[PDB]
Design a protein around this ligand. Sequence first.
Ligand SMILES: NC[C@@H]1O[C@H](O[C@H]2[C@@H](O)[C@H](O[C@@H]3[C@@H](O)[C@H](N)C[C@H](N)[C@H]3O[C@H]3O[C@H](CO)[C@@H](O)[C@H](O)[C@H]3N)O[C@@H]2CO)[C@H](N)[C@@H](O)[C@@H]1O
Ligand SMILES: [Mg+2]
Ligand SMILES: [Mg+2]
Ligand SMILES: [Mg+2]
Ligand SMILES: [Mg+2]
Ligand SMILES: [Mg+2]
Ligand SMILES: [Mg+2]
Ligand SMILES: [Mg+2]
Ligand SMILES: [Mg+2]
Ligand SMILES: [Mg+2]
Ligand SMILES: [Mg+2]
Ligand SMILES: [Mg+2]
Ligand SMILES: [Mg+2]
Ligand SMILES: [Mg+2]
Ligand SMILES: [Mg+2]
Ligand SMILES: [Mg+2]
Ligand SMILES: [Mg+2]
Ligand SMILES: [Mg+2]
Ligand SMILES: [Mg+2]
Ligand SMILES: [Mg+2]
Ligand SMILES: [Mg+2]
Ligand SMILES: [Mg+2]
Ligand SMILES: [Mg+2]
Ligand SMILES: [Mg+2]
Ligand SMILES: [Mg+2]
Ligand SMILES: [Mg+2]
Ligand SMILES: [Mg+2]
Ligand SMILES: [Mg+2]
Ligand SMILES: [Mg+2]
Ligand SMILES: [Mg+2]
Ligand SMILES: [Mg+2]
Ligand SMILES: [Mg+2]
Ligand SMILES: [Mg+2]
Ligand SMILES: [Mg+2]
Ligand SMILES: [Mg+2]
Ligand SMILES: [Mg+2]
Ligand SMILES: [Mg+2]
Ligand SMILES: [Mg+2]
Ligand SMILES: [Mg+2]
Ligand SMILES: [Mg+2]
Ligand SMILES: [Mg+2]
Ligand SMILES: [Mg+2]
Ligand SMILES: [Mg+2]
Ligand SMILES: [Mg+2]
Ligand SMILES: [Mg+2]
Ligand SMILES: [Mg+2]
Ligand SMILES: [Mg+2]
Ligand SMILES: [Mg+2]
Ligand SMILES: [Mg+2]
Ligand SMILES: [Mg+2]
Ligand SMILES: [Mg+2]
Ligand SMILES: [Mg+2]
Ligand SMILES: [Mg+2]
Ligand SMILES: [Mg+2]
Ligand SMILES: [Mg+2]
Ligand SMILES: [Mg+2]
Ligand SMILES: [Mg+2]
Ligand SMILES: [Mg+2]
Ligand SMILES: [Mg+2]
Ligand SMILES: [Mg+2]
Ligand SMILES: [Mg+2]
Ligand SMILES: [Mg+2]
Ligand SMILES: [Mg+2]
Ligand SMILES: [Mg+2]
Ligand SMILES: [Mg+2]
Ligand SMILES: [Mg+2]
Ligand SMILES: [Mg+2]
Ligand SMILES: [Mg+2]
Ligand SMILES: [Mg+2]
Ligand SMILES: [Mg+2]
Ligand SMILES: [Mg+2]
Ligand SMILES: [Mg+2]
Ligand SMILES: [Mg+2]
Ligand SMILES: [Mg+2]
Ligand SMILES: [Mg+2]
Ligand SMILES: [Mg+2]
Ligand SMILES: [Mg+2]
Ligand SMILES: [Mg+2]
Ligand SMILES: [Mg+2]
Ligand SMILES: [Mg+2]
Ligand SMILES: [Mg+2]
Ligand SMILES: [Mg+2]
Ligand SMILES: [Mg+2]
Ligand SMILES: [Mg+2]
Ligand SMILES: [Mg+2]
Ligand SMILES: [Mg+2]
Ligand SMILES: [Mg+2]
Ligand SMILES: [Mg+2]
Ligand SMILES: [Mg+2]
Ligand SMILES: [Mg+2]
Ligand SMILES: [Mg+2]
Ligand SMILES: [Mg+2]
Ligand SMILES: [Mg+2]
Ligand SMILES: [Mg+2]
Ligand SMILES: [Mg+2]
Ligand SMILES: [Mg+2]
Ligand SMILES: [Mg+2]
Ligand SMILES: [Mg+2]
Ligand SMILES: [Mg+2]
Ligand SMILES: [Mg+2]
Ligand SMILES: [Mg+2]
Ligand SMILES: [Mg+2]
Ligand SMILES: [Mg+2]
Ligand SMILES: [Mg+2]
Ligand SMILES: [Mg+2]
Ligand SMILES: [Mg+2]
Ligand SMILES: [Mg+2]
Ligand SMILES: [Mg+2]
Ligand SMILES: [Mg+2]
Ligand SMILES: [Mg+2]
Ligand SMILES: [Mg+2]
Ligand SMILES: [Mg+2]
Ligand SMILES: [Mg+2]
Ligand SMILES: [Mg+2]
Ligand SMILES: [Mg+2]
Ligand SMILES: [Mg+2]
Ligand SMILES: [Mg+2]
Ligand SMILES: [Mg+2]
Ligand SMILES: [Mg+2]
Ligand SMILES: [Mg+2]
Ligand SMILES: [Mg+2]
Ligand SMILES: [Mg+2]
Ligand SMILES: [Mg+2]
Ligand SMILES: [Mg+2]
Ligand SMILES: [Mg+2]
Ligand SMILES: [Mg+2]
Ligand SMILES: [Mg+2]
Ligand SMILES: [Mg+2]
Ligand SMILES: [Mg+2]
Ligand SMILES: [Mg+2]
Ligand SMILES: [Mg+2]
Ligand SMILES: [Mg+2]
Ligand SMILES: [Mg+2]
Ligand SMILES: [Mg+2]
Ligand SMILES: [Mg+2]
Ligand SMILES: [Mg+2]
Ligand SMILES: [Mg+2]
Ligand SMILES: [Mg+2]
Ligand SMILES: [Mg+2]
Ligand SMILES: [Mg+2]
Ligand SMILES: [Mg+2]
Ligand SMILES: [Mg+2]
Ligand SMILES: [Mg+2]
Ligand SMILES: [Mg+2]
Lengths: 272, 49
Amino acid sequence: AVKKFKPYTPSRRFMTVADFSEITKTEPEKSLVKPLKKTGGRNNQGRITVRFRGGGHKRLYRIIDFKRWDKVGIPAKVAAIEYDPNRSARIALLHYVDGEKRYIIAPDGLQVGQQVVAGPDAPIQVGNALPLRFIPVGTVVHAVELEPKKGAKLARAAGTSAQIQGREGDYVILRLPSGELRKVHGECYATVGAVGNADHKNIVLGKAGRSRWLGRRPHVRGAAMNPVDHPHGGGEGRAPRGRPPASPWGWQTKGLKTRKRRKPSSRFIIAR
Amino acid sequence: MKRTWQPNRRKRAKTHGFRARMRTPGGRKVLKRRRQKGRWRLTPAVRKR
RNA sequence: CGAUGUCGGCUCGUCGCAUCCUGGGGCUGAAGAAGGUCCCAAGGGUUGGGCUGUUCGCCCAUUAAAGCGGCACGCGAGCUG
RNA sequence: GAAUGCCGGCAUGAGUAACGAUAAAGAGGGUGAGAAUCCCUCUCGCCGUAAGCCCAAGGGUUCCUACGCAAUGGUCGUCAGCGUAGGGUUAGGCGGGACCUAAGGUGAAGCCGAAAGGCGUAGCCGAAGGGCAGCCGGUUAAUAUUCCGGCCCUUCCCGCAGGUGCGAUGGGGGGACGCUCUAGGCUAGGGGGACCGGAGCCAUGGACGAGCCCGGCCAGAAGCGCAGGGUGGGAGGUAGGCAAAUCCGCCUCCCAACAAGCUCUGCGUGGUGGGGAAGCCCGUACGGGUGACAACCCCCCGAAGCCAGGGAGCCAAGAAAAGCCUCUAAGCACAACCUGCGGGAACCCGUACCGCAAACCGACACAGGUGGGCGGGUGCAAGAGCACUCAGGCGCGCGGGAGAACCCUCGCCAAGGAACUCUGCAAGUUGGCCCCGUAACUUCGGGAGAAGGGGUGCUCCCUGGGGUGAUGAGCCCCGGGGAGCCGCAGUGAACAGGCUCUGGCGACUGUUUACCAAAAACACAGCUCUCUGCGAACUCGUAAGAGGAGGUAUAGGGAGCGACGCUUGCCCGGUGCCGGAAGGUCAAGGGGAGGGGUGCAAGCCCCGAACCGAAGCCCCGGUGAACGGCGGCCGUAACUAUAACGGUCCUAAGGUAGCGAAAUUCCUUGUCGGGUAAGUUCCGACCUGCACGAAAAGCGUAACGACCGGAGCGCUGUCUCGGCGAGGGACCCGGUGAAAUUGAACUGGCCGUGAAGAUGCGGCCUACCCGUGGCAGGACGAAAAGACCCCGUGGAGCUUUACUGCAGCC
RNA sequence: GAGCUAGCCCUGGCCAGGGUGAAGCUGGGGUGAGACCCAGUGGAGGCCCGAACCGGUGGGGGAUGCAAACCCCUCGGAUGA
RNA sequence: UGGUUCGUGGAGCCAUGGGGGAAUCUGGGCGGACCACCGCCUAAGGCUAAGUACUCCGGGUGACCGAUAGCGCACCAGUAC
RNA sequence: AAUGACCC
RNA sequence: CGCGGGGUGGAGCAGCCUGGUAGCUCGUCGGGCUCAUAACCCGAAGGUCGUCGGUUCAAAUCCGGCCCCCGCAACCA
RNA sequence: CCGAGGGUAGGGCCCGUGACUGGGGCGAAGUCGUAACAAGGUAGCUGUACCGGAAGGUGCGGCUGGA
RNA sequence: GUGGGAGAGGGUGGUGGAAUUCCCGGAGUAGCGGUGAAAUGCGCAGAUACCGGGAGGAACGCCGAUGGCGAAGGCAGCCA
Ligand SMILES: NC[C@@H]1O[C@H](O[C@H]2[C@@H](O)[C@H](O[C@@H]3[C@@H](O)[C@H](N)C[C@H](N)[C@H]3O[C@H]3O[C@H](CO)[C@@H](O)[C@H](O)[C@H]3N)O[C@@H]2CO)[C@H](N)[C@@H](O)[C@@H]1O
Ligand SMILES: [Mg+2]
Ligand SMILES: [Mg+2]
Ligand SMILES: [Mg+2]
Ligand SMILES: [Mg+2]
Ligand SMILES: [Mg+2]
Ligand SMILES: [Mg+2]
Ligand SMILES: [Mg+2]
Ligand SMILES: [Mg+2]
Ligand SMILES: [Mg+2]
Ligand SMILES: [Mg+2]
Ligand SMILES: [Mg+2]
Ligand SMILES: [Mg+2]
Ligand SMILES: [Mg+2]
Ligand SMILES: [Mg+2]
Ligand SMILES: [Mg+2]
Ligand SMILES: [Mg+2]
Ligand SMILES: [Mg+2]
Ligand SMILES: [Mg+2]
Ligand SMILES: [Mg+2]
Ligand SMILES: [Mg+2]
Ligand SMILES: [Mg+2]
Ligand SMILES: [Mg+2]
Ligand SMILES: [Mg+2]
Ligand SMILES: [Mg+2]
Ligand SMILES: [Mg+2]
Ligand SMILES: [Mg+2]
Ligand SMILES: [Mg+2]
Ligand SMILES: [Mg+2]
Ligand SMILES: [Mg+2]
Ligand SMILES: [Mg+2]
Ligand SMILES: [Mg+2]
Ligand SMILES: [Mg+2]
Ligand SMILES: [Mg+2]
Ligand SMILES: [Mg+2]
Ligand SMILES: [Mg+2]
Ligand SMILES: [Mg+2]
Ligand SMILES: [Mg+2]
Ligand SMILES: [Mg+2]
Ligand SMILES: [Mg+2]
Ligand SMILES: [Mg+2]
Ligand SMILES: [Mg+2]
Ligand SMILES: [Mg+2]
Ligand SMILES: [Mg+2]
Ligand SMILES: [Mg+2]
Ligand SMILES: [Mg+2]
Ligand SMILES: [Mg+2]
Ligand SMILES: [Mg+2]
Ligand SMILES: [Mg+2]
Ligand SMILES: [Mg+2]
Ligand SMILES: [Mg+2]
Ligand SMILES: [Mg+2]
Ligand SMILES: [Mg+2]
Ligand SMILES: [Mg+2]
Ligand SMILES: [Mg+2]
Ligand SMILES: [Mg+2]
Ligand SMILES: [Mg+2]
Ligand SMILES: [Mg+2]
Ligand SMILES: [Mg+2]
Ligand SMILES: [Mg+2]
Ligand SMILES: [Mg+2]
Ligand SMILES: [Mg+2]
Ligand SMILES: [Mg+2]
Ligand SMILES: [Mg+2]
Ligand SMILES: [Mg+2]
Ligand SMILES: [Mg+2]
Ligand SMILES: [Mg+2]
Ligand SMILES: [Mg+2]
Ligand SMILES: [Mg+2]
Ligand SMILES: [Mg+2]
Ligand SMILES: [Mg+2]
Ligand SMILES: [Mg+2]
Ligand SMILES: [Mg+2]
Ligand SMILES: [Mg+2]
Ligand SMILES: [Mg+2]
Ligand SMILES: [Mg+2]
Ligand SMILES: [Mg+2]
Ligand SMILES: [Mg+2]
Ligand SMILES: [Mg+2]
Ligand SMILES: [Mg+2]
Ligand SMILES: [Mg+2]
Ligand SMILES: [Mg+2]
Ligand SMILES: [Mg+2]
Ligand SMILES: [Mg+2]
Ligand SMILES: [Mg+2]
Ligand SMILES: [Mg+2]
Ligand SMILES: [Mg+2]
Ligand SMILES: [Mg+2]
Ligand SMILES: [Mg+2]
Ligand SMILES: [Mg+2]
Ligand SMILES: [Mg+2]
Ligand SMILES: [Mg+2]
Ligand SMILES: [Mg+2]
Ligand SMILES: [Mg+2]
Ligand SMILES: [Mg+2]
Ligand SMILES: [Mg+2]
Ligand SMILES: [Mg+2]
Ligand SMILES: [Mg+2]
Ligand SMILES: [Mg+2]
Ligand SMILES: [Mg+2]
Ligand SMILES: [Mg+2]
Ligand SMILES: [Mg+2]
Ligand SMILES: [Mg+2]
Ligand SMILES: [Mg+2]
Ligand SMILES: [Mg+2]
Ligand SMILES: [Mg+2]
Ligand SMILES: [Mg+2]
Ligand SMILES: [Mg+2]
Ligand SMILES: [Mg+2]
Ligand SMILES: [Mg+2]
Ligand SMILES: [Mg+2]
Ligand SMILES: [Mg+2]
Ligand SMILES: [Mg+2]
Ligand SMILES: [Mg+2]
Ligand SMILES: [Mg+2]
Ligand SMILES: [Mg+2]
Ligand SMILES: [Mg+2]
Ligand SMILES: [Mg+2]
Ligand SMILES: [Mg+2]
Ligand SMILES: [Mg+2]
Ligand SMILES: [Mg+2]
Ligand SMILES: [Mg+2]
Ligand SMILES: [Mg+2]
Ligand SMILES: [Mg+2]
Ligand SMILES: [Mg+2]
Ligand SMILES: [Mg+2]
Ligand SMILES: [Mg+2]
Ligand SMILES: [Mg+2]
Ligand SMILES: [Mg+2]
Ligand SMILES: [Mg+2]
Ligand SMILES: [Mg+2]
Ligand SMILES: [Mg+2]
Ligand SMILES: [Mg+2]
Ligand SMILES: [Mg+2]
Ligand SMILES: [Mg+2]
Ligand SMILES: [Mg+2]
Ligand SMILES: [Mg+2]
Ligand SMILES: [Mg+2]
Ligand SMILES: [Mg+2]
Ligand SMILES: [Mg+2]
Ligand SMILES: [Mg+2]
Ligand SMILES: [Mg+2]
Ligand SMILES: [Mg+2]
Ligand SMILES: [Mg+2]
């Protein structure tokens, strides 16, 4: 839906906030299962190695369930859907009959009170997790494992999915959010449905501060700098570059493919 | 204005203390040099309890 | 070049005369009045504004006239910038 | 004898500048060898959201007392933060440690690295965070939540007494959390009182009066009362909580739905204890006595604090561990644990004084810098603002006269009102509140405090709401109406927008050259390109490892552009990148036709042609929000002028839209029109654009701006054009007393001359010896071994299709 | 050597008093149901005025200074990047 | 690749990171590419006095200093600052 | 695979 | 003032560097197609190569001096 | 008290004029092309959109006022 | 009102085949495209033509009419 504001201030005239109506009466989270201390820090042991990180709201990590094959066969009741500061998506709090409480990343269409479960069994319904094999060709799916028993790694961003395209002996072909065509092992779990919160892309930050709230420090142009700092630094009053556009570290930034050629992963990929 | 000396007993101790110098080869040599020199004070005297 | 601060303005001046005005004079194609033009003469005078950093210049309203030039393109241990 | 030489000593400027905020002083009396400067008293002035008080940091003896003044103090010094000596810092409850965990550090296992060393789950360390039992008074010259008094607590250990399955570093629960706005009831704190207590006081015209003045509090266990916080009770089933569990979790039934009940805080009250003014008298540097058997009561205002884990809303989604409760395991159930009650035990370190400052950071008793808490009263709409002022603390460690110039800070001014100047720079005008009243334009929010106005004091009368109170008096908040008084003037002082029109740039709040640039630069939401399938790309590291990310294409890196509106044309020839299992070239290696050296030979050893050989390059393509680029010359219409039209050369393609003498226009003050009396600026146009142009974006845009340009009104010392007054210096007297500079000096003008600008040489002219206040023209005056310029086979930063390497990638 | 300065990490603190009045809620109105429109409440915002506090805009002083960045007047921000 | 006078040189010897990879006296290395002859040595384990270097320290001597010299310090100096 | 000066 | 590129029939361009021959397109002229004009078709004409000088057997071409034309440069002060 | 009017301040409507600029009407024999009327030599006309000296072309849908 | 009838009337969800294009494998050569005629273009780096597999979007042939439905604009594979 997206919340919109009137221009009672500049920067309030474009600003735009998510709709939280799917956030069920459960705004503060769940101890026990999560949260952990989350360790803010824009850099490695010592030095900054990703520029322009820092500031922005304190967070608690929700330790979510990315391998659903523990509770094969054990169903769970979806108890709530809550805000997760550390991902684009929303998260489902679910209660297993087992007693155990996990969070699943919350797919589009998930309703509270719903039944959900994981395993070879598993009715093909939104919320359920299955090894890729038993899932019908052509159904859209998410939180897909890359290699079996290694955890969900594909399609967890808000409003993303992959579609099952066909099969090939032990592998089923996937079409990933990027549009790539991937052979992913049959035995990999993946949960049916799309991610949801799909209006995430429609949000307009609206002002500088908002950027900072999310811990995004000001990014400065190479043009703004000096020859010591950047290939684009200097010279006089503005300058068009004077070389093929580059990163600060000298590599070209328009076109230069960067995936290493001889990756053994290659023989499992069929697209862009 | 604000000058450059902003005394702190803990800082002076953690920074220039006998135990800091002892911790690394760089520092151990400092004690060696100061000893051979005949320095009355190997490290700065940080006070208080 | 072990430093002579460099435009313009301002402030204060002072000097040259190849005189802008005033005083004296010759010639005039000088009727008179007003001019032209040369010579004598610097004692005093030589306005206020619009534009531009401007010097200069062009305008506006005047004036007896709105002189030219030197003084480290006079003058920053005097000011401005 | 010179090196702007090195070290030291003493000169010159010079009794000169200064003596560190313009808050301010005067006198009388003491002490003393010596008083503007020390003590005391009286008067005056200054601070008072401090210039007062309480903590933290830092400092470390500066605290208190006695004796002292050589030095230290910008003067003096009998004084001191100074010299000499002596004294002073008392804790189970305050803070820190025999408690916990944060970032981070360290680090067993483990990983890595020529060595040194780098990492690293556990653990350990790490605190203004969590945990934790003290309040009110009295005493010292100097310490007290520490000593003492009163009242109140907490831990251990040993006993008895009564309970129960007790029992872990292990399970769960809890601890436990954002921002903004907030209700109810309280406390802190403050105002009023005809009420209560009190020494006293009638002045100078009047008042012996609900007269003036002073004070009417503090703590306090149990128990109560008032607020408020926490929380459901049962019974079964159970596969989860990494062994167990009665615990938690999930499910299913019953009873509550409530704070009803348990509790747990806060506030009142409480046995009791403590304090208790002015004034008056004293002898202290200061405190003492009395006032007192002090009284210790009623209203009102009232928090930002408390009840606290209260409530509502919002998006950016808000530490951990221990203590604590509960569950059980090994064990043990003569142990053990819980509750009550006795007795006993309760260590280590800090405690002085300064602490917005003369004791901390600034070489100084330096006008600068320094985190937290309290910060009273009156008014002005409010307030921590402003004026005065409690408490308290100061008059800033040189003074006395004088009343020139000139300077600083300040006040006023005839007439004129920007004529000043690069510029209204500066300075004035404006100014709070209430009420009228407000345009273009606009993104419908705005522009707006538009502009422009009027009201503002005090008195008396009438009258409307609330709050606390019983529905009432009072006390306290907001209003309305009518008469009336005074002055030049009523936010009568102090605090408190000058306004408008129109361009440029940037959308906007923000950021920046600490110490000459706050901007039109940077950032910014948003737009596009491109890389990246996840052991991601990328960054750091030799590696291990880590960041990215406990993320996963709506995500992450790189690039440019930079809200938004309308748009962003053409060229892929060159360069870059992307795509091409053909082809050409292509190194080590494979291959050996063939040849060479030695041997009597077997042999041993050398070169070495075909041919098989990667990436890279060549070649074939694509690709512009990739690096980039986007022409010339002649002719032509029935007045001239001009050229819709045409020819021709060249390119990879020849600039579209929209702008345009512009932050861009050389010629140039282009040419018309506008503002002016007059306008190289400004605005509107024209287009001959030296040399605009579409994401190094193009043309626009409401709002925004300590940005930059032009205009007008208002107002003025900016000016014509100055004048006067004020205080701080300047000046004279007493005390203290520098500096750069300095070859030596007995240091005049003119015209000359001289290395070409002479006090010093020539000729003349002038001129008695020496100071004080002033002005700066000269001493090519001081200051800095010129910044600019060249020089040096001097040096650095930076760039690239300069050379040559290296990392990195292939 | 990060006790100055730049950034980030952990844990705390601070921001008087006034304005303006977004959403939402509630009531009324409109419709077949709506959209929407009026009140009232509510209290949003890199919103406004203004102390602390953080700055450093213009001018003047200071220039062997009080100060190797100071002082006066004036000005920007002040719930947020 | 390093070492040696040896910088790729006709480049051996000695050491070694990578690849291949023997022999036990009729076995192996060397005598400067290489081959023949003639010789010299016995690799792939280790220890081993003395002659040699140094002067914190003690002594001796000086065509060495004599307090701006001589050590930074003749003096309570790696102190004060 | 273009064009047909003016008025009548 | 400096630099380096340029003047060829009526128009626009080649031809030069490796000296001897001046060629392309348009236009002009004559004829044809058409009722006529243009388009189209067939034939033809047309160039002191800016001037001055000589180098050569011979100069559009090579070399000097001037003259117009175009483009660049004019910086540190 | 009110009050003609004068003054100051800001709006509303209307008239005139303005460098320059936009298209329009009209004016016997100037320029360029051929769009339409015959299947006008690409059926035309149409709304919209883009492009072009100019008529105009093209895309998309539509109409018979064409076969 | 009761009881019936035809229909491409509308909205939502799902689904079928023919064909075009692109990708992959096979087999296969010297030209294919295109027009008034050509050229641009694609193709010896393996094109066009043919077979097998896959991806994907769009529009529904025959039925079909000079037909039906709707207020017009307009409505056409099938299913609910
Ligand atoms: N004529 C009215 C409107 O304007 C235009 O028409 C105007 C012009 O286009 C037209 O110009 C024509 C030209 O088209 C035609 N081919 C040649 C003719 N000589 C010109 O003629 C014009 O100029 C001449 C002299 O100058 C005048 O005398 C004559 O009256 C006038 N019509 O002249 C008209 C002025 O009267 C539109 N084409 C027309 O269709 C439109 O309706
Ligand atoms: Mg690191
Ligand atoms: Mg480290
Ligand atoms: Mg940027
Ligand atoms: Mg820069
Ligand atoms: Mg670089
Ligand atoms: Mg430039
Ligand atoms: Mg360029
Ligand atoms: Mg550049
Ligand atoms: Mg010089
Ligand atoms: Mg000199
Ligand atoms: Mg000098
Ligand atoms: Mg004369
Ligand atoms: Mg005469
Ligand atoms: Mg004169
Ligand atoms: Mg001017
Ligand atoms: Mg003169
Ligand atoms: Mg001159
Ligand atoms: Mg001059
Ligand atoms: Mg001069
Ligand atoms: Mg200047
Ligand atoms: Mg000498
Ligand atoms: Mg000396
Ligand atoms: Mg003197
Ligand atoms: Mg003097
Ligand atoms: Mg003096
Ligand atoms: Mg003083
Ligand atoms: Mg006062
Ligand atoms: Mg002492
Ligand atoms: Mg003392
Ligand atoms: Mg004494
Ligand atoms: Mg003294
Ligand atoms: Mg003392
Ligand atoms: Mg500890
Ligand atoms: Mg370590
Ligand atoms: Mg610990
Ligand atoms: Mg604590
Ligand atoms: Mg304690
Ligand atoms: Mg004390
Ligand atoms: Mg006690
Ligand atoms: Mg138990
Ligand atoms: Mg626990
Ligand atoms: Mg009397
Ligand atoms: Mg009272
Ligand atoms: Mg268990
Ligand atoms: Mg009480
Ligand atoms: Mg008493
Ligand atoms: Mg709450
Ligand atoms: Mg622990
Ligand atoms: Mg102990
Ligand atoms: Mg103490
Ligand atoms: Mg104390
Ligand atoms: Mg303070
Ligand atoms: Mg001070
Ligand atoms: Mg000090
Ligand atoms: Mg002092
Ligand atoms: Mg402060
Ligand atoms: Mg207060
Ligand atoms: Mg008040
Ligand atoms: Mg006020
Ligand atoms: Mg004040
Ligand atoms: Mg005046
Ligand atoms: Mg006057
Ligand atoms: Mg006036
Ligand atoms: Mg003027
Ligand atoms: Mg003037
Ligand atoms: Mg101006
Ligand atoms: Mg001003
Ligand atoms: Mg302006
Ligand atoms: Mg503006
Ligand atoms: Mg800006
Ligand atoms: Mg700053
Ligand atoms: Mg600066
Ligand atoms: Mg600014
Ligand atoms: Mg500045
Ligand atoms: Mg944009
Ligand atoms: Mg990692
Ligand atoms: Mg992570
Ligand atoms: Mg990005
Ligand atoms: Mg930019
Ligand atoms: Mg473009
Ligand atoms: Mg190109
Ligand atoms: Mg290219
Ligand atoms: Mg190409
Ligand atoms: Mg390539
Ligand atoms: Mg080879
Ligand atoms: Mg070989
Ligand atoms: Mg190759
Ligand atoms: Mg122009
Ligand atoms: Mg003009
Ligand atoms: Mg004019
Ligand atoms: Mg203009
Ligand atoms: Mg230009
Ligand atoms: Mg530009
Ligand atoms: Mg561009
Ligand atoms: Mg821009
Ligand atoms: Mg700003
Ligand atoms: Mg600004
Ligand atoms: Mg004056
Ligand atoms: Mg005066
Ligand atoms: Mg005075
Ligand atoms: Mg004196
Ligand atoms: Mg003399
Ligand atoms: Mg001379
Ligand atoms: Mg002499
Ligand atoms: Mg002389
Ligand atoms: Mg004198
Ligand atoms: Mg002088
Ligand atoms: Mg002077
Ligand atoms: Mg001088
Ligand atoms: Mg020099
Ligand atoms: Mg050289
Ligand atoms: Mg720091
Ligand atoms: Mg509302
Ligand atoms: Mg604000
Ligand atoms: Mg403010
Ligand atoms: Mg405060
Ligand atoms: Mg100044
Ligand atoms: Mg301010
Ligand atoms: Mg070698
Ligand atoms: Mg070597
Ligand atoms: Mg060599
Ligand atoms: Mg080896
Ligand atoms: Mg060997
Ligand atoms: Mg060998
Ligand atoms: Mg040998
Ligand atoms: Mg030999
Ligand atoms: Mg040998
Ligand atoms: Mg051996
Ligand atoms: Mg001697
Ligand atoms: Mg010595
Ligand atoms: Mg001696
Ligand atoms: Mg010495
Ligand atoms: Mg024609
Ligand atoms: Mg006629
Ligand atoms: Mg002919
Ligand atoms: Mg220069
Ligand atoms: Mg008009
Ligand atoms: Mg036609
Ligand atoms: Mg047609
Ligand atoms: Mg047509
Ligand atoms: Mg059309
Ligand atoms: Mg077209
Ligand atoms: Mg194929």
